Amino acid sequence: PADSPHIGKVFFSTNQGDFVCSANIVASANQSTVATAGHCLHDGNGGQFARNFVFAPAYDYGESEHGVWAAEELVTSAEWANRGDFEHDYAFAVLETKGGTTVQQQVGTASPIAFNQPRGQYYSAYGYPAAAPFNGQELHSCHGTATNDPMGSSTQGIPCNMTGGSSGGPWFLGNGTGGAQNSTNSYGYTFLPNVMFGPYFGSGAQQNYNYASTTN
Amino acid sequence: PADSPHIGKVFFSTNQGDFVCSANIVASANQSTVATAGHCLHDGNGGQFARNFVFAPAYDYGESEHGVWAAEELVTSAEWANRGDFEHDYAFAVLETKGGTTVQQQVGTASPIAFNQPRGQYYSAYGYPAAAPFNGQELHSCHGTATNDPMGSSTQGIPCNMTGGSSGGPWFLGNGTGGAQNSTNSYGYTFLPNVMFGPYFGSGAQQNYNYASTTN
């Protein structure tokens, strides 16, 4: 985590309990924006937003020297919020500033983010899987070539063993944590998933990003 | 109302019961977008989306020939949804398509929409006020020059006697229903009778519009 401190762990609550996800600081005008999954910050089907959304950059068996960051605005895709549309299971959280210090300023790095890229690219996906065989404490990764959702939606799948808690973690184009972010961990099929699915980052994601990243 | 069928009445429900608002068809790529107030489609801080949001173009003691249109995507500003911030009490609803027909195609017209315009312009504001001495059945209007929020926020006020139900109704630059939409009826203050406040249509509103109008 110390080497890619833009990636971090998410804690949040709903009426059903206390849960975890992952997220990533993306380059933004407000320097306060993390990319995550829609389902990590909103119920879907017209419901309420998650409560007490906290981001922990470079989490590693606990918060890092970078600390933990509360959300000020949760920015869900409209298709996710209204219909639980997994084709648009992406979102951005706009975090607090601490006495002038934005999360980007504290952590000192943020991922570029790209949209409307070809399908079928090679990805490195990251997150904090929390269900067995994982413990929720470690940054893990998956790597491989994306293929189409066999069930027929616009999502893409990569070979991956990560479990619940990894949702919202970044997909970077290419090998490693240094590429442009171009999707987010959305879902796998239990038990012992072997494919991670992530939504296509098209013009919906781009325009949601433009909006979130400017405050908003 | 027949002369300005892009303006219409809104019905919706929450856990607190059935409510009414106003809205306006604005030109959009998806041909399906109405401008309204954030509070006409989302509770604000800690709440959820309105249910059964329906738009009735050219309502006049009942639906017009254009019928009634259900929302598919409610698109609230982030600051309204997360904090009930009246500086951003604007929103867009993306409506259903009926047998291939979009609302903009049905009505055959839409208002232009403008952002980042000067403060203190002259407006014509419209809506379906539903509290006495109004009955919710009629299109009413207010006209005047905008002044600054006495509370010091970025909202603006105009002289206007319209009551609950008028929220979400359009403010058009200039005289009449034909100008560019540049705010929405949002709120009054208990101490200030007959003044309607509407949010500033700035870059937040523009980016929310860009996003909503492409479906989204």
Q: CB B46 to CB A47 under 8 A?
A: no
Q: CB A207 to CB B211 under 8 A?
A: yes
Q: Which amino acid is at A16?
A: Q
Residues 31-90 of A with CB under 8 A from B: 46-49, 51, 72-75, 77-79, 81-83
CATH of the domain at B196: 2.40.10.10
| Residues paired with A127 in a beta bridge | A140
What CA–CA distance (Å, rounded) separates A153 from B41? 29
Residue of B nearest to A78 (CA): B216
What CA–CA distance (Å, rounded) separates A121 from B79? 35
Same structural domain, B32 and B87: yes
B210 touches chain A (CB under 8 A): yes
DSSP B151-184: TSSS-EEEE----TT-TTPEEEESSSSSS-EEEE
Q: CB B214 to CB A203 under 8 A?
A: yes
- Spatial CB neighbours of A180, under 8 Å, sequence gap ≥ 6: A111, A112, A113, A114, A172, A173
How many CA atoms lie less than 13 Å away from B105 in the CB half-sphere? 12
Same structural domain, A1 and A102: yes
Q: Which amino acid is at B115?
A: F
Same structural domain, B147 and B171: yes
- SS3 label, residue B21: strand
Number of folded domains that form chain A = 2
Pick from B60, B90, B111: which residue ends a domain?
B111
- A166 dihedral zone (left: phi>0; alpha: psi -120 to 50; beta): alpha
Pick from A83, A111, A139: which residue ends a domain?
A111
Same structural domain, A83 and A122: no
The secondary element (H helix, E strand) that includes residue B207 is helix B203-212
| Residues paired with B51 in a beta bridge | B13
Residue of A nearest to B44 (CA): A48
Same structural domain, B20 and B103: yes
How was this structure determined? It was done by X-ray
What is the layout of strands, in order, in the sheet containing A170-173?
A: A140-145, A122-127, A170-173, A181-184
Pick from B96, B111, B126: which residue ends a domain?
B111
User: Do B95 and B34 contact (CB within 8 A), yes or no?
Assistant: yes
Residue of A nearest to B71 (CA): A82
Q: CB B51 to CB A46 under 8 A?
A: yes
Same structural domain, A141 and A103: no
DSSP B71-133: EEEEEE-HHHHHH--GGG--EEEEEP-BTTB-HHHHHS--B-B--SPPSS-EEEEEE---STT
Q: CB A83 to CB B73 under 8 A?
A: yes
Residue of A nearest to B214 (CA): A204
What CA–CA distance (Å, rounded) separates B90 from B68? 22
Among A21, A68, A26, A9, residue whose Cα is nearest residue A183: A26
What CA–CA distance (Å, rounded) separates B37 from A104? 33
Closest Cβ–Cβ partner in B51, B207, B216 for A214 = B207
Closest Cβ–Cβ partner in B46, B47, B82 for A73 = B82
Rounded to a whole number of angstroms, the distance from the CA of A207 to the nearest CA of chain B is 6
Q: CB B46 to CB A51 under 8 A?
A: yes
Residues 86-125 of A with CB under 8 A from B: 94
Residue of A nearest to B204 (CA): A216
Same structural domain, B107 and B118: no
What CA–CA distance (Å, rounded) separates B155 from B137? 28
Same structural domain, B50 and B96: yes
Q: CB A49 to CB B81 under 8 A?
A: yes
The secondary element (H helix, E strand) that includes residue B196 is strand B192-198
Interface probe, candidates B28, B207, B213, chain A, greatest A C-beta count within 10 A = B207
Rounded to a whole number of angstroms, the distance from the CA of A116 to the nearest CA of chain B is 15
Same structural domain, B98 and B175: no
Same structural domain, A130 and A205: yes
Which residues of A fall within a CB distance of 8 Å from B214?
203-204, 207
- Give the experimental resolution in Å: 1.4
Same structural domain, A99 and A191: no
Same structural domain, A13 and A104: yes
* CA distances for A201 relative to A90, A122, A155, A205, A206, angstroms: 8, 14, 9, 5, 7
Q: CB A204 to CB B215 under 8 A?
A: yes
Q: CB A208 to CB B216 under 8 A?
A: yes
Angle, alpha carbons A48-A52-A54 (nearest 5°)? 125
CATH of the domain at B215: 6.10.250.400
What CA–CA distance (Å, rounded) separates B164 from B129? 6
Closest Cβ–Cβ partner in A74, A83, A211 for B208 = A211
Closest Cβ–Cβ partner in B48, B73, B83 for A78 = B73
Q: CB B74 to CB A78 under 8 A?
A: yes
Q: CB A73 to CB B72 under 8 A?
A: no
Structural domain harbouring A41: 1-111
